[PDB]
Subunit: 273 residues, 2 copies
């Protein structure tokens, strides 16, 4: 490609040596596929190890379990602390009506550079009903899953919105050297049973009709709006722009699974930027 | 204290909620401590696979040296994983075989020169040395936790060393006075190697006139011998702690590591693709 001029002038006996290295490069890649699969099993094996601290965190956010004294001693901001810290705790008094941690997952998702662009303002009060975000991996349907848990809400009846990605760990047969890790095959969202007139994924538009029975009058059409909850209506795999869009969907699921869920409080508090 | 981009929300938080956030920081450390064990087991996994790669890398070293002849299956494998047909066959006939061209000349020089990050480290006076580069190899270790890169040189007029080794010491446990910044294995120390240079051919040094700061010739131009820009400063990395002595080295030390990572994690597994030029960065595809 970018050294094509050198490759062209290579004598044929040397070219054949380069062909031999490409054949070897396929074998090295096949092993790298076995590696990533064993890394995948490792992510799964550790899910049980994380579960305790993630379950404990869900109880704190819902107000279902009260913090222990040892937890009170942990500094709220690992930054500068001493008496400079003590006046921070004294900045606002306790409110027994303030139960749990309000707007927790909204704040963590809004604080991530990539995700914040997906959250529009008409999405904001919906994500306030977000109790927990969950992820889990799988081998037989190879890939992982993200579960969004919503409390009872006036926007829709669903209590969990699931986003599942089907991942391929083997090199593509008609692009074997292109392999750099697990690639997406398919993304499957979820169907949202919205309540009336509150579907944010949809949008009403007015246009003057020029001809017909409604000439000189406005019809109200319904079209797509920008919303985070389009995340659960992903592009299909099967304008060839989709291959950009599917990756854009995937790059968001990666951010949610790999970074925010293990570091939720640090995005809430803003110690990562 | 605007290390926190949500500081305004955190301050006005009522205290009973603040206490809930403190509890989440306690949990975040436990998650990180578990994440520390994960990266350790990925490290153990990387070591376990070294034996599996070695054969294919050993086969590749033999091909580059001209020690082994390609097989029929390999002759049929396309040289360029791009467009090929009759567009391909005319490439093979573009130049005739030369039996004096043994092995693959300038392989590792071309592979490293083709990488975005490394090409900036290779200056022109480094080029004829890297033609003596026979093989680049890397391997990880537990006891001094980290990994190592060894550069294999044939006999050469530039120095006597036959292998130059670059060793990185990695930390897999969270910082005791920064546990929440943990995001993976971090570099503790990078250790280069002493190069037995020949006479008048040491590229790492450079004779320059420089204004003297103290002494009898203060304010005057002496001929000092000082460091030159060369890839081979890679083997004299900055030291750790044993705005100019802290935040300089600590930035340079990571920059050294980020080069060893590219060499270990990206170039060595994909050497031929950098040679052929189908990759030029850690943005693989």
């Amino acid at each position: 490609s970018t050294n094509f001029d050198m490759i062209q002038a290579l004598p044929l006996n040397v070219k054949q040596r380069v062909c031999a290295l490409k054949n070897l490069q396929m074998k090295t890649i096949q092993i790298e596929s076995d590696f990533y699969k064993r890394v995948h099993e490792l992510e799964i094996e550790f899910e049980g190890k994380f579960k305790s601290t993630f379950d404990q965190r869900k109880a704190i956010v819902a107000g279902e379990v009260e913090p222990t004294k040892e937890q009170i001693d942990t500094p709220i901001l690992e930054g500068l602390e001493g008496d400079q810290l003590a006046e921070l705790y004294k900045a606002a008094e306790a409110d027994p009506s303030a139960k749990g941690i309000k707007d927790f997952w909204l704040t963590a998702l809004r604080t991530h550079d990539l995700v914040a662009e997906a959250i529009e303002e008409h999405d904001v009060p919906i994500l306030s009903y977000l109790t927990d975000v969950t992820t889990a991996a799988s081998k037989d349907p190879a890939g992982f899953k993200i579960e969004f848990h919503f409390a009872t809400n006036p926007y829709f009846k669903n209590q969990v919105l699931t986003k599942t990605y089907l991942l391929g760990f083997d090199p593509d047969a008609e692009a074997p050297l292109q392999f750099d890790g697990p690639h997406v095959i398919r993304a499957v969202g979820d169907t949202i049973e919205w309540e009336d007139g509150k579907n944010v994924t949809k949008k009403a538009v007015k246009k003057k009709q020029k001809k017909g029975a409604n000439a000189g009058k406005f019809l109200t059409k319904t079209v797509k709006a920008d919303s985070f909850f389009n995340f659960f209506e992903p592009p299909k795999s099967k304008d060839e722009q989709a291959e950009e869009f599917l990756e854009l969907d995937y790059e968001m699921g990666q951010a949610i699974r790999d970074t925010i869920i293990p570091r939720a409080v640090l995005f809430y508090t803003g110690e990562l930027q």
